[PDB]
Structure 1
């Protein structure tokens, strides 16, 4: 990794050798195509899995779903010669990639559904979720079908960095920037193009010296557990708007709403969308310990105030 870097704040121009981390969480992953190793071998594994009765594989990353989208036309016509007749149909869940609990099985009008909905035939469970791994540098072919059921994200594409008082928790579809002010550490950026559920591996987190009930992004949704994951006056956002499209976290009150500090709110509560079902705006909002600048999101339906901003549509993560 030979290169240069410029920091206009610190006006430094060091070059040479080292370690660099990038911010490729935006629309830049479509540049390089994804070629799984030995597509012929994958057909045998798919055929073996169908024997038990597994409904299908629900992907965990947008890259995984794009791999299936690209290979749908390239693998469906392959096994036609072998006369196996296992049709592959790819559904389109937008960004609500959920967790399944099953690994692959060993080699010993049917349709192999992928990302099937909550149909009565079988639930989200009884499906393969995260039984895959990258070979290297995730030209090259980088895919591996392993039988190791793990409840974390794959660590060959992730990253993290600290450069003094800065911070960064990089990921292909996730990014969290942190900085230190007045001693404690705070969050000032957070984006997520999807809704994963693999927990951040402990080998890529910075400063594991915190417990639960004090972070901002819970570890279930795929948030790092670190001292750099915290905002003053806010606890873990269990009932937050984490089931949405590409998000963003802003430290500002929303256009039409306002927050009035009080002391008779209903504890934690649950988050509420800015626009209620009744169509009437409610400027009455109360807070207990949060700072007077509220936190604002930017996703599918717009503003979703956190749990602590109570009035006087709801998150369904659990």
Structure 2
């Protein structure tokens, strides 16, 4: 067990389990490391032999690993005198999943991450094929090609009417004010894996048509992932990659509830592409305070929120 001391203005000490937030920390405390870059390289040789253009990362740290290891891998690949050039790209927005998966055991090109292409489909990319051995993190090959995120990375906790589902890239908070409902969400990444129900709190009788964070977007199948007058934000501003969902009004905007408002569609931003600000918003059934997203390009509103009088075409949505 983990024995120590923590302070909230109350002080408490003892033994138990401590769940940390590594998302909001400006410092990068964790890095990913391989146990056998040789085995990895061989698995990539096999993958290319098994017909694979490249691989797509599940998380940000995996991508950073692929980046920091690519030269050595290519070097190793050259050390084995096997003709292949490994190319690692960047991650942006939702990390799309790959249907292929690695198996443990002029020049060609192996495309790790990067943007989409016609030469290499997502179905030819490998994904979710690296798990954690132990803790800098000793990683390794997986059992099989499950569409779940790594269990050793997931975490969760609940006490004093505050529930948290946490990850190395996610930080999801719900609370009990009259009822249990989602409160906050923090994202460094957006991934296409599924949140394991082993590390999930309150998973019984969960309507997937109501869970805000999408299941196929590592959304916890939980009644904590619930918010009255909301549904799954399938078409939300997840194209940001890094964002902060909360339940308040965007700065300088006003949202009201009315039947006169339109139907739910792709999330929109307060700021026009031209820079024009809209202050008047509406929802047909949403529950004030409204679902908002804080990111790079500014604030966005939930799918349920549409502008009152302004035409939707004038705005920017999830493309």
User: Does the alignment reach a TM-score above 0.5?
Assistant: yes
Shift of 1:95: 4.1
Greater shift, 157-166 or 291-300, is seen at 291-300
1:205 to 190, 200, 204: 200
Shift of 1:247: 0.8
Does structure 1 residue 224 correspond to structure 2 residue 255? no
Shift of 1:33: 4.1
1:111 to 105, 109, 112: 109
Residue in structure 2 matched with residue 89 of structure 1 by the alignment: 87
Shift of 1:126: 1.5
CA distance in 1, matches of 2:306, 2:16: 48
CA spacing shift, 1:82–1:249, aligned 2, 3 Å: closer
Query: Does structure 1 retain, via aligned residues, the 8 Å contact 2:54–2:110?
Result: yes
Query: Does structure 1 retain, via aligned residues, the 8 Å contact 2:85–2:110?
Result: yes
2:147 to 122, 142, 151: 151
CA distance in 1, matches of 2:275, 2:18: 49
CA spacing shift, 1:309–1:110, aligned 2, 3 Å: same
Q: State the secondary structure of the residue aligned to 1:156.
A: coil
CA distance in 1, matches of 2:11, 2:202: 26
Residue in structure 1 matched with residue 20 of structure 2 by the alignment: 22
Q: State the secondary structure of the residue aligned to 1:80.
A: helix
The aligned runs of 1:1-318 (5 Å cut-off) are 1-8=2-9, 11-15=10-14, 17-27=15-25, 30-105=28-103, 107=105, 109-137=107-135, 142-146=138-142, 148-182=144-178, 184-209=179-204, 210-277=206-273, 279-311=275-307, 312=309, 313-316=316-319
Question: Could you list the runs of 5+ residues in structure 2 that have no partner in the other structure?
Answer: 310-315
Shift of 1:178: 1.3
Query: Does structure 1 retain, via aligned residues, the 8 Å contact 2:4–2:13?
Result: no
Shift of 1:245: 3.0
Q: State the secondary structure of the residue aligned to 2:48.
A: helix
Query: Does structure 1 retain, via aligned residues, the 8 Å contact 2:250–2:300?
Result: no
CA distance in 1, matches of 2:35, 2:5: 34
Shift of 1:135: 0.6
CA distance in 1, matches of 2:104, 2:71: 26
Shift of 1:34: 3.0
CA distance in 1, matches of 2:120, 2:144: 23
CA distance in 2, matches of 1:81, 1:308: 56
Higher strand proportion (structure 1 or 2): 2
Q: State the secondary structure of the residue aligned to 1:130.
A: coil
Equivalenced residues, count: 309
Q: State the secondary structure of the residue aligned to 1:59.
A: coil
Greater shift, 228-237 or 150-159, is seen at 228-237
User: Once the two structures are superposed, what CA deviation does each residue of 1:176-218 show, in whole Å capped at 9, x if it has no partner?
Assistant: 1111011x11222210101111111000111113212222212
What RMSD over aligned residues (CA atoms) do the two structures have, in Å? 2.1
Greater shift, 158-167 or 79-88, is seen at 79-88
CA spacing shift, 1:292–1:45, aligned 2, 3 Å: closer
CA distance in 2, matches of 1:238, 1:78: 41
Question: Could you list the runs of 5+ residues in structure 1 that have no partner in the other structure?
Answer: none
CA distance in 2, matches of 1:282, 1:14: 49
User: Once the two structures are superposed, what CA deviation does each residue of 1:232-270 show, in whole Å capped at 9, x if it has no partner?
Assistant: 222221221122132112332222322233212233233
CA spacing shift, 1:176–1:85, aligned 2, 3 Å: same
Shift of 1:147: 5.3
